[PDB]
């Protein structure tokens, strides 16, 4: 249990993770499918126990680096997996392996996924963060008070469209 | 605003644990990975559709504990600071709305807590700022004063707004708890965004149903051809299923761009919302529910946006 | 196959490779050991009649 | 699936029933290929077509005239823009009104005074802790408050949160003069 | 606006009154369901 | 040389312009293909 392994049952056979759970099963069947006909919890052959099949450990080897020309440290995150399948730190879309994890907030420079991005920084490292929304800044408001601007800047903003 | 980032391996869905099924999948070349950076490449342009609709504002700015906006009751959208940070109607937005076969679902940049920290910013900028903050600096004004540039921009002196300044409070707070009972009596307000749910849910449907079609072989499964039938027998019955089911990669990455096209047109329009009704005012009739448009209050969805076009 | 620097150059077929994220290949846990699985087959034909 | 890549390869060994099995597979598969060049280039022209659509629409209320679409063409308000052309594309520079420099002011919705509601014509009211002045929304310039400057509607006990003020009439010191 | 609302039927175009070809294309799965899904769908979008 | 002719060298067929280039074929390069991995430059056998 608990590991990606093949099966011959009585019934059927393919590749898949054994594990238990309280799902029922009627004892006049073999084996189950869910909702899109795939390979779902089945009767275990021998006395009436309810195997739950979990699909195997699969992903994508989503390789984090900077740029070649300032340094050749990388990072390596496997999609939709633990560390437990296999610098090492769970994120939220999988196993981080080869970035040091940073509380403090950054600009996302390499986005990543689910609030985390990458950044090569402080002996410079690739370092993981929270992706920062911009800057905490509260406004002070009132009814009797405004802000009106006493000296402005012309500033012109370049515009790219193909 | 964006659709579900998926990134189907196109060598898993052809070949599920086959080496021999891979020996003739390699006689195809590079269809098989070109189909792999198509996906891979729209799943970073839903990122960039949340970027340029909700990632709009410089500095996250916080509501002030001063609640007094001239009367108007902000409740229902501001977020609760005791759940996630989620307004009662975000909470209703995500609530009216509901794996390793070579699909690979990938997250989003933007979580429902941080699209919801947009939100609060780009909300507490409109409620105490008006619009300064999306044009420059955050400017604080009250809002009463900024009502009236609002009632002014319209053609209706500021005049007619102190006048009825409870009022116009009154009617405010009124229309947003009909928002919330509506949204709490019919989830048929956001079937819109279940009909996103919908065309990607149907197009991984039919992509994973697929794999248990023929398509002209002795058996769907791989292992049964090449167990039952001789090589030189599999290496057609085996090519069928190659055949048939990269129609089904080109098939659901075809329907991807092209709703790729769709989302992007509405995260344009989305976008183009954000930038010009919420963080601005437009005299554009129709372009902000219905009605010469006073204000725009932005609320988080699953993958999407919502506006409350308040209008005169 | 040497490092995942390397899977990134010969993801995209060029020495030099920039600032971002790319999916060179697919992890997969492969098997090791077969959890195959009889109903107690026993209870055979008389043959020894 | 073919026996080999090259058209001409499978012309010069095989007889035409042996090459027109293997030159199909070729045929299936070039043609496949084409579809799906054109099936991306068509969806992507349609990309680039809204994007070109984006552009004319951005050049002429930006170059050819001035947007009053907040954040549309650049960050700020948009006073003006200048195109410049790029390879298979073109390039903007929207100039745009920021402010700079900014202070607090103390202000009101309106002032009184004779019991009648004087509300700003065009700006708004400030104050520097002493004295009023009217002011527009995008710059400092505290002008006296005058009838010239001011509207008058309604009364001072309809309004919340008016404050009191003295107004300066041009015609009193004109019919004093 | 629009364009001709066109509902071709997917399965008497590839198999016109033929039971032999009915069954063979049985065997590609849902590609002539989606299609004619993919038809209902343009077909309503014009209507939009 | 200089003209459209049709080429055999050792099974290497197709249709081209003949010339001189300044393609460095090594001892032991036969002959050379595009990026298409179609033959693009090729070495007389009779004398190099």
Not at chain 4, 2 to 21: F, T
Request: charged share 15%; aromatic share 8%; net charge negative.
């Amino acid at each position: 249990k608990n590991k990606c392994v093949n099966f011959n049952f009585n019934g059927l056979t393919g590749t898949g993770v054994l594990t238990e759970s309280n799902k029922k099963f009627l004892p006049f069947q073999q084996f189950g499918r869910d909702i899109a006909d795939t390979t779902d919890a089945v009767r275990d052959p021998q006395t009436l126990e309810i195997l739950d099949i979990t699909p195997c450990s699969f992903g994508g080897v989503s390789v984090i680096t900077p740029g070649t020309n300032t340094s050749n440290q990388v990072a390596v995150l496997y999609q939709d997996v633990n560390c437990t399948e296999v610098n090492v730190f769970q994120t939220r879309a999988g196993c981080l392996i080869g970035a040091e994890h940073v509380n403090n907030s950054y600009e996302c420079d390499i986005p990543i996924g689910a609030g985390i991005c990458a950044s090569y920084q402080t002996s410079q490292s690739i370092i993981a963060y929270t992706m920062s929304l911009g800057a905490e800044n509260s406004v002070a408001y009132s009814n009797n008070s405004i802000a009106i601007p006493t000296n402005f800047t012309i500033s012109v903003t370049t515009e790219i469209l193909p | 605003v964006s659709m579900t980032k998926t990134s189907v391996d196109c060598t898993m869905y052809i070949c599920g644990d086959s080496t021999e099924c891979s020996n003739l999948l390699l006689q195809y070349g590079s269809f098989c990975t070109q189909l792999n950076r198509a996906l891979t490449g729209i799943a970073v342009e839903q990122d960039k559709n949340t970027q340029e609709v909700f990632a709009q504002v410089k500095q996250i700015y916080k509501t002030p504990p001063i609640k007094d906006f001239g009367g108007f009751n902000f409740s229902q959208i501001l977020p609760d600071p005791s759940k996630s940070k989620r307004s009662f109607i975000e909470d209703l937005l995500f609530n009216k709305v509901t794996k390793f076969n070579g699909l690979t679902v990938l997250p989003p940049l933007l979580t429902d807590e941080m699209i919801a920290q947009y939100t609060s910013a780009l909300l507490a900028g409109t409620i105490t700022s008006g619009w300064t903050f999306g044009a420059g600096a955050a400017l604080q004004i009250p809002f009463a004063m900024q009502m009236a540039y609002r009632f002014n921009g319209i053609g209706v002196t500021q005049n007619v707004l102190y006048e009825n300044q409870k009022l116009i409070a009154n009617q405010f707070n009124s229309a947003i708890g009909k928002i919330q009972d509506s949204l709490s009596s019919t989830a048929s307000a956001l079937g819109k965004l279940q009909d996103v749910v919908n065309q990607n849910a149907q197009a991984l449907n039919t992509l994973v149903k697929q794999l248990s079609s023929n398509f002209g072989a002795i058996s769907s499964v791989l292992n049964d051809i090449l167990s039952r039938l001789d090589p030189p027998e599999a290496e057609v019955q085996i090519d069928r299923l190659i055949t048939g089911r990269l129609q089904s990669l080109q098939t659901y990455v075809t329907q991807q761009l092209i709703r790729a096209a769709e989302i992007r047109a509405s995260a344009n329009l989305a976008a183009t919302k954000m930038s010009e009704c919420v963080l601005g005012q437009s005299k554009r009739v129709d372009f902000c529910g219905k009605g010469y448009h006073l204000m725009s209050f932005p609320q988080s969805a699953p993958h999407g946006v919502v506006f409350l076009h308040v209008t005169y | 196959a040497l490092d995942p620097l390397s899977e990134t150059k010969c993801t995209l077929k060029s020495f030099t490779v920039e600032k971002g994220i790319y999916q060179t290949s697919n992890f997969r846990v492969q098997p090791t050991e077969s959890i195959v699985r009889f109903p107690n087959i026993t209870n055979l034909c008389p043959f020894g009649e | 699936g073919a026996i080999s890549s090259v058209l001409n390869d499978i012309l010069s060994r095989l007889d035409p029933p042996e090459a027109e099995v293997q030159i199909d597979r070729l045929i299936t598969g070039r043609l496949q290929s084409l579809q799906t060049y054109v099936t991306q280039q068509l969806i992507r022209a349609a990309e680039i077509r809204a994007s070109a659509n984006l552009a004319a629409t951005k050049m002429s209320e930006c170059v050819l005239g001035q947007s009053k679409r907040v954040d549309f063409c650049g960050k700020g308000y948009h006073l003006m823009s200048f195109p410049q052309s790029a390879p298979h594309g073109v390039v903007f520079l929207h100039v745009t009104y920021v402010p700079a420099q900014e202070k607090n002011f103390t202000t009101a919705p309106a002032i009184c005074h004779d019991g009648k509601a004087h509300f700003p014509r065009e700006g708004v009211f400030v104050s520097n802790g002493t004295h009023w002045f009217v002011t527009q929304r995008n710059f400092y310039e505290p002008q006296i408050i005058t009838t010239d400057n001011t509207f008058v509607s309604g009364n001072c006990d309809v309004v919340i949160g008016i404050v009191n003020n003295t107004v300066y009439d041009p015609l009193q010191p004109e019919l004093d003069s």
